[PDB]
Ligand binder design. Structure first.
Ligand SMILES: [Zn+2]
Lengths: 58, 159, 48, 396, 31, 50, 126
RNA sequence: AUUAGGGAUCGGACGGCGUUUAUUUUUGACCCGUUCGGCACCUUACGAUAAAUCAAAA
């Protein structure tokens, strides 16, 4: 049960995946800066109003 | 018959006389027919469409022979949409006008759409076997039905 | 007349088949006194 | 799954009967209006909720449409027509200061992002559009030969002069306002219930359809659907995009509300309440932290997104902990143990047995199709993918 | 007992039977 | 014919719309491929250039 | 066999209002059923309906109506009798409607009060 | 007015990627899909109500 039976959907190779995780993420095994960088969410939402975008950025 | 001629009544009569002579080699319902009736009112904007009223045995006479006849009459006559209709004087008569107006296709359904209020509309949906040569004529069929009867019906092929 | 929020809730806990009575309850022209507890339990709300 | 306590509150008394339309203040942060089945509208503040701020018996029949203008005024649609009221005045005026009736029965309202223009989906198969303070009858734009009642209509905020819409022909339609004409008409297998656009990706948009399913498209190409979000039992009554545009509310006809990521293909959350009776209008607030569910139990319930993640400013280790657990999930979400106790969510009996029957029947249908394909000449063909298969036809 | 049923008579599905005595009993209450 | 006429007219309209969406495709591509998204957007902060 | 096709239709609408559907296919049609549906659409308790032919009717229903019923003996009624009948037939005077065939056609009790025409109670809903 | 369909059941009628009759066409046997019609199971009741009775005492 602690095995993972099915490959995860973005993945294409078992070796890709088993070597993809490879790294503990907590503060015990890396520096605090890498911790911040490794647990940062993809999207950050502050307080306020998300008014939809007026001018195309890039 | 029942009229004294008009400027395009004589035109459609002389048309069917030059279909009597100097052409085919196909002659079934043309000679036992005289001036019967014709009518011309605007359809769309900028365009016209002729309708010709015909008696009730000549209805199925033209149902025997109407292929390519409407085609040639359209081409050499004013380059406009030709419609063939009976002359009659209530709802069964209106369905008769419908099934006479649509000659190559049998209708499938009449659809009475009520709305969120007492407004209502009709949609008659036609056969699936012939679709290509009608969609440029569907609006003309609809407006001539609206002018001859007065009821608002829209014509469509179901999907 | 006064209806407690517990009573209102209990009515809504009764299913859609009680919708007429629910609407009768929710006719506006009457006061609505709230409750501040966990219970939503009509009888105790009333007795207290 | 311990701290999942996502319900929050019940906005005041609610309406009298069921609540059928509601809309936000897309400029400020706390102003909500909803119109009832009994022709009355109420306007609510989020900070003070236990009582209404403003109330007016608007129409006779159900309040089909409702929206806020840019400045301070608001507009409601029904079978009586459409009217314009003002909720924030030192006197509480009851009389609406504008009205319109011609153009047939209007269905739905939508208001422009920047300008003072707004569009209305009528029942006449036609959308008529006004520019406020200098228009009276508005421009009636429609498909050339179209009759069927257009249900929904929506101003696309990011790319202006663009409005998509949808009718009961199980077709949706796209329009332009610079050149005031329809643009594209595409017909689906099933009837759509509502259309919204992706407020952070302009070319992307969203239909909720009685095929119990949600479809995301790119407007530039309707050849195949971009996303099939399928989780439901009954018809979906309404969808709305999160203002961050990566999340999606889906209220459906069964008493459920399902919260979605943008790329998912399944639920992240399902909400159900034995009180709640039918869902009709679900809108995020301007915060993408809270969603609002407008019932036919006559409630406007306030739910949280981020099913456990309580609001509040956080101490440093508290948020480091919660972000730590989040990305910890995004590694280990697929192990069987933790997967089952993250997917385990209790459903009421109705939707439970119904989805059992649904999965069974769809298995039967797939088996039918597979046996027919294998024992038919379709075997020498490609398995047509479903995002392709969802569209019936596209035309212009 | 179901709350939605009217009390003038009995109901089978969507059909409401009203005997002649009950409509005459309404004919007494109107006068 | 009115049908093909409005067809080509709405086709040109469709082309122009797709041009106007091609003006956003680059931003959409960036944000969907990027590492971190900020909200609310810097451009739509009410106090921008002060 | 039930000769009241309008009762069969009302039973269809009642079962669909119980199970929560979004349309029905009422196989036998009649003009009086059309008129009942028009009064229903005036009071908004049904979404939208189309008469189709071979005919039947597709009746998209919203889920606001609760219960349909037909008065089988088709009872004659006058004005004060209309008020007392409607107060003993609906659970509340501000909920639901009854249907009358009057000399001015088929309408609800509020319309029959506006025209001050009496008639014959046939059916009702809420 | 249906429950709500599935798994099987056979009586037609229709089709077909195909095996065997078939020395090759019929046609017949196996398999698949559609369709009506019905002997019956279970599920959920759509409810019930007089309960021991139910896809009918809904
Ligand atoms: Zn209490």
């Amino acid at each position: 049960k602690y095995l993972a039976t099915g490959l995860p959907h973005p993945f294409e190779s078992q070796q890709q995946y088993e070597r993809s995780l490879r790294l503990p993420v907590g503060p015990e095994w890396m520096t605090k800066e890498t911790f911040q960088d490794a647990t940062k969410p993809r999207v950050i939402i502050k307080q306020g109003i998300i008014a939809p975008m007026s001018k195309p950025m890039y | 018959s029942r009229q004294n001629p008009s400027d395009l009544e004589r035109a459609i009569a002389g048309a069917l006389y030059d279909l009597e002579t100097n052409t085919a080699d196909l002659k079934a319902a043309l000679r036992p027919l005289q001036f019967v009736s014709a009518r011309e009112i605007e359809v769309g904007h900028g365009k016209k469409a002729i309708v010709i009223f015909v008696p009730v045995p000549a209805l199925q006479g033209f149902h025997r022979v109407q292929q390519r006849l409407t085609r040639e009459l359209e081409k050499k006559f004013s380059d406009r949409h030709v419609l063939i209709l009976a002359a009659r004087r209530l709802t069964a008569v209106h369905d008769a006008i419908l099934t006479d107006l649509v000659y190559p296709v049998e209708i499938v359904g009449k659809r009475l759409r009520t709305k969120e209020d007492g407004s209502k509309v009709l949609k008659v949906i036609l056969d699936e076997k012939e679709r290509g040569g009608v969609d440029y004529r569907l609006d003309t069929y609809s407006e001539v039905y609206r002018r001859l009867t007065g009821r608002n019906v829209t014509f469509e092929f179901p999907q | 007349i006064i209806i407690t929020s517990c009573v209102m809730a209990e009515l809504e806990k009764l299913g859609p088949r009680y919708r007429v009575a629910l609407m009768i309850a929710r006719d506006e022209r009457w006061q609505r006194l709230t409750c501040d507890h966990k219970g939503t339990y009509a009888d105790d709300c009333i007795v207290d | 799954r311990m701290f999942a306590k996502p319900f929050l509150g019940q906005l005041g008394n609610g309406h009298v009967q069921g609540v059928y339309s509601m809309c936000k203040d897309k400029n400020s942060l706390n102003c909500i209006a909803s119109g009832s089945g009994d022709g009355v509208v109420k306007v609510w503040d989020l900070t003070t909720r236990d009582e209404e701020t403003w109330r007016v018996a608007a129409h006779n029949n159900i309040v089909k449409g409702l929206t806020f203008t840019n400045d301070k005024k608001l507009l409601s649609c029904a079978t009586d027509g459409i009217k314009l009221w003002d909720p924030y005045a030192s006197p509480s005026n009851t009389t609406p200061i504008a009205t319109w009736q011609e153009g047939g029965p209007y269905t739905s309202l939508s208001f422009h992002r920047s300008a003072n223009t707004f569009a209305a989906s009528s029942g006449q198969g036609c959308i008529r559009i006004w520019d406020l303070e200098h228009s009276t009858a508005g421009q009636a734009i429609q498909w050339p030969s179209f009759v069927d009642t257009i249900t929904d209509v929506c101003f696309n905020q990011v790319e202006t002069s663009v409005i998509g819409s949808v009718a009961t022909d199980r077709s949706i339609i796209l329009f332009d306002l610079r050149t005031n004409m329809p643009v594209i008409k595409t017909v689906l297998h099933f009837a759509c219930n509502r259309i919204v656009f992706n407020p952070m990706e302009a070319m992307n948009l969203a239909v909720a359809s009685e095929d119990h399913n949600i479809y995301i498209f790119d407007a530039r190409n309707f050849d195949k659907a971009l996303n099939i979000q399928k989780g439901h039992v009954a018809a979906v009554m309404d969808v709305e995009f999160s203002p961050t545009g990566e999340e999606l509310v889906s209220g459906s006809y069964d008493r459920t509300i399902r919260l979605w990521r943008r790329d998912a293909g399944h639920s992240r959350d399902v909400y159900h309440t034995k009180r709640m009776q039918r869902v009709f209008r679900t809108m995020w607030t301007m915060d993408s932290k809270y969603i609002l569910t407008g019932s036919d139990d006559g409630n406007v319930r306030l739910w949280r997104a981020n099913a456990s993640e309580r609001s509040g400013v956080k101490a440093t280790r508290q948020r480091q902990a919660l972000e730590y657990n989040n990305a910890l999930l995004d590694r280990y979400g697929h192990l069987p143990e933790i997967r089952r106790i993250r997917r385990h969510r209790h459903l009421p009996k109705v939707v439970k047995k119904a989805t059992e029957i649904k999965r069974e029947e769809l298995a039967a249908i797939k088996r039918r199709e597979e046996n027919e394909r294998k024992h038919s000449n379709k075997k020498y063909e490609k398995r047509k993918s479903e995002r392709e298969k969802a569209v019936l036809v596209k035309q212009q | 007992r179901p709350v939605d049923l009217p009390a003038v008579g009995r109901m089978r599905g969507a059909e409401l039977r009203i005997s002649a005595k009950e409509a005459a009993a309404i004919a007494r209450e109107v006068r | 014919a009115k049908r093909q006429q409005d067809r080509l007219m709405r086709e040109a309209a469709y082309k122009k719309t797709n041009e106007t969406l091609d003006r956003w495709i680059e931003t959409v591509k960036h944000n969907r491929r990027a590492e971190h998204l900020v909200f609310p957007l810097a451009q739509n902060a009410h106090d921008r250039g002060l | 066999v039930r000769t009241s096709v309008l009762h069969d239709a009302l039973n269809s609408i009642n079962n669909a209002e119980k199970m929560g559907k979004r349309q029905v296919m009422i196989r036998p049609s009649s003009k009086v059923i059309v008129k009942f549906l028009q009064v229903m659409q005036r009071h908004g308790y049904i979404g939208e309906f189309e008469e189709v032919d071979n005919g039947k009717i597709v009746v998209q229903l919203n889920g606001r109506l609760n219960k349909c019923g037909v008065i089988s003996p088709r009872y004659n009624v006058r004005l004060a009798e209309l008020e007392k009948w409607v107060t003993k037939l609906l659970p509340a005077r501000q909920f639901g409607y009854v249907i009358l065939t009057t000399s001015a056609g088929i309408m609800d009790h509020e319309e029959a009060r506006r025209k001050h025409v009496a008639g014959k109670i046939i059916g009702f809903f809420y």
